[PDB]
Amino acid sequence: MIAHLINTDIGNRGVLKVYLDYRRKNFNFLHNSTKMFLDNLERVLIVTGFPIPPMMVAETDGPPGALAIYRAVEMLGGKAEILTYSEVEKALEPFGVSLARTPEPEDYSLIISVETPGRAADGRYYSMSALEIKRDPLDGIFLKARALGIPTIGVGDGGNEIGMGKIRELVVGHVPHGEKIASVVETDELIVSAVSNWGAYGLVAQASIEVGRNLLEGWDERRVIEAISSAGLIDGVSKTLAPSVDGIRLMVHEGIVELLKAVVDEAIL
Amino acid sequence: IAHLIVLKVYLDYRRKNFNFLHNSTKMFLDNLERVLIVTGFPIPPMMVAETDGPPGALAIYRAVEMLGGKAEILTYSEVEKALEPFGVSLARTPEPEDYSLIISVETPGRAADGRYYSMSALEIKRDPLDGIFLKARALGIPTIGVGDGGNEIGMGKIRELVVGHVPHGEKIASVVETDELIVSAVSNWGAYGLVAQASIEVGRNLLEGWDERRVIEAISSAGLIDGVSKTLAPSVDGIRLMVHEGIVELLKAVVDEAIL
Ligand SMILES: [Mg+2]
Ligand SMILES: [Mg+2]
Ligand SMILES: [Mg+2]
Ligand SMILES: [Mg+2]
Q1: A45 - beta bridge partners?
Q2: Strand partners, A153
Q3: Is the bond into B96 cis (omega within 30 degrees of 0)?
Q4: Interface of B with A in 145-204 (CB under 8 A)
Q5: Which end of chain A is more exposed for a tag (fewer CB within 10 A), N or C?
Q6: Which candidate in A13, A258, A264, A269 is best for mutational testing of the B interface (most B CBs within 10 A)?
Q7: CATH class of the domain defined by B1-260
Q8: With an 8 Å Cβ cutoff, are A254 and B254 in contact?
Q9: Which CATH number fits domain A1-269: 3.30.70.60, 3.90.1640.20, 3.40.50.1240, 3.30.420.10?
Q10: Contacts of A238 in chain B (CB under 8 A)
């Protein structure tokens, strides 16, 4: 089971307990997110980028997952665009990604978020340690998407990201500073995972099984993370230019991607 | 770890007993003197042992000795045959009191009516292996169980969860209790998780060198069948080796991340 794997025990009690409760009530959240995904591939807007205090620089968690989704959208026949901050744009350049310009919800068939800050109750943006984020927000377009009724999907691994507002109670209860940190921004479908990137791959993995083709094949976790790390995107925990994400080294992320590919291939045969 | 390792039964268990893997691990590490490991799960109608369990028993067996303890295995004859190549100590006329720890990796447990059932409610007709866990509990001897369906030794500890989630549950849920219980998708993974956890507790990767493919093909050739297809395929629980290899590699990396 993909939804389970992407939530593997990291050492982060919060996310795990959120997953347990969230899943007890929405057992098939990953599949539901996948149906919405598959049904609206015409023109997908993908948003990522999470500034990290005190520098306010974007981290390694989120961009890779976005890239993986983008790649899958095109393989399935749709078009995609990415909405992020400057550094993240530079980091993804080697991959020739279409960058969204003066985007309006109406223009897209689906808008997905991978590790993007979501407004808290007090209208402010917070990191997992309760440090206010100072930088132009990206969640604004989701509020408009929701008001227009345009399909929305959120991926997060902490409680403070876009789409997390759907399970705000779970965050307040299981995560530190949850009351002040939890985002209120809702999403039509939500994917919770231990590492946002993983949640992203899980979507692709499930889509792959739904379609009968492994859309994850070719993905080189190592290369992608080294590339964006080189380009200046920092690790969210060590807050340094280490080739890792969420304080975890590549062997673990690489292992999850490989198992995902394996599970997908098995299910397809 | 406790996660990487029916899904609804696990889901509830981890919510009720959040530290079941850690607690199992603690017990494991504090009673390595002489460990009795029991496996072997008959598959009706043939009543021949499957590929799920023995590989797990073997990995635990290896870890006990690497930690300075001694291990013995209690199983059915074909499983003995299958494990022979690994130079495993077999148990002879074993007594509860003789061990500091008794562990079960996918072994059938009596149901409420004293009989043994497969997850499909077919009756398992072959000599029990669970009696020693009943006496072990009455004697106060540390006991750990690993299972993946609800009819295995140790599953008695969460009987309420099995009767509710599993089909035929009321009839097949095992009554046999164990002090600590490890629930997992595939029992082998449950056993590996135990070793992976012990590894982290000990600052040493006890799974290093574990060759999943090697083990499964070996016991498969030896005669042990895939539980789901009931055939001589080199798989366990109807899942091909590459998924199991991936699970093991993931566990090894998690351990490394923690150790270093
Ligand atoms: Mg993160
Ligand atoms: Mg986060
Ligand atoms: Mg079973
Ligand atoms: Mg099994």
Answers
A1: A81, A111
A2: A112, A189
A3: no
A4: 185
A5: C
A6: A258
A7: alpha beta
A8: no
A9: 3.90.1640.20
A10: none
